[PDB]
């Protein structure tokens, strides 16, 4: 109902103004118009929410770091729980946008792998803050989203593909950071890297830097791991 070109224009204005809450709101209304998103719009939605949840991820770490060092700790904890509530609201908004629109609309394997990686990413962020029974189900949903995206990417995507390479990076970090398997991480990362360099010559110029950057960060995570 609202003109989508206007929402995308203001989303870019919001991005430049560092008003990411506004930027997410614009891209949420675009997505909720039911049509499948262009690569630009999809990238705008991804940056917006990545920044909105990024702010709460960092604030949570700070306050949770304070909570570990009887009335002071009770104030930190209450605040920490306020930040988690916002973090779970943002993640749920995104996960629900993926379930209702983005994943069901994904015409091609490139799109489908992107959105299923996004679902792994936002369950991963929930996992960083979740506890108990809630958490186990959360961690499980993340591994499933990533794992299915991988299989679609092995089958339908040139290892060249940046979307496929970004998926391998975050899945390997999910293994490393969330599941404490350093050996499942480097293996994943090692494999996806050299699958792509073997076919580095086929890479198109509109995708060369995007792929090679991720490939570098694959190696970068390796060195630290």
């Amino acid at each position: 109902h609202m003109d989508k070109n206007e929402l995308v224009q203001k989303a870019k204005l919001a991005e430049q103004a560092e008003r990411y809450d506004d930027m997410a709101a614009c891209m949420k209304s675009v997505t909720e118009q039911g049509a499948e998103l262009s690569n630009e719009e999809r990238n705008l939605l991804s940056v917006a929410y990545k920044n909105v949840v990024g702010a709460r991820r960092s604030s949570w770490r700070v306050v949770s770091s304070i909570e570990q060092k009887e009335k002071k700790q009770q104030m930190a904890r209450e605040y920490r729980e306020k930040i988690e509530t916002e973090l779970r609201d943002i993640c749920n908004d995104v996960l629900s946008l993926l379930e209702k629109f983005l994943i069901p609309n994904a015409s091609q394997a490139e799109s489908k792998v992107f959105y299923l990686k996004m679902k792994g990413d936002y369950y991963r962020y929930l996992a960083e803050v979740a506890a108990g029974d809630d958490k186990k189900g959360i961690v499980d949903q993340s591994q499933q989203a990533y794992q299915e995206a991988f299989e679609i990417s092995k089958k339908e995507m040139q290892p060249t593909h940046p979307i496929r390479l970004g998926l391998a990076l975050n899945f390997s970090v999910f293994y490393y950071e969330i599941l404490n398997s350093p050996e499942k991480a480097c293996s994943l990362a090692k494999t996806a890297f050299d699958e792509a360099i073997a076919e580095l010559d086929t890479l198109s110029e509109e995708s060369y830097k995007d792929s090679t950057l991720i490939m570098q960060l694959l190696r970068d995570n390796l060195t630290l791991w």
């Binding site: 999809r42 990545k50 990413d121 970004g166 990076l169 975050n170 970090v173 960060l217 630290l224």
Partner: peptide
């Protein structure tokens, strides 16, 4: 670790 910085 370093997750993907831009989509």
């Amino acid at each position: 670790s370093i997750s993907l910085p831009v989509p």
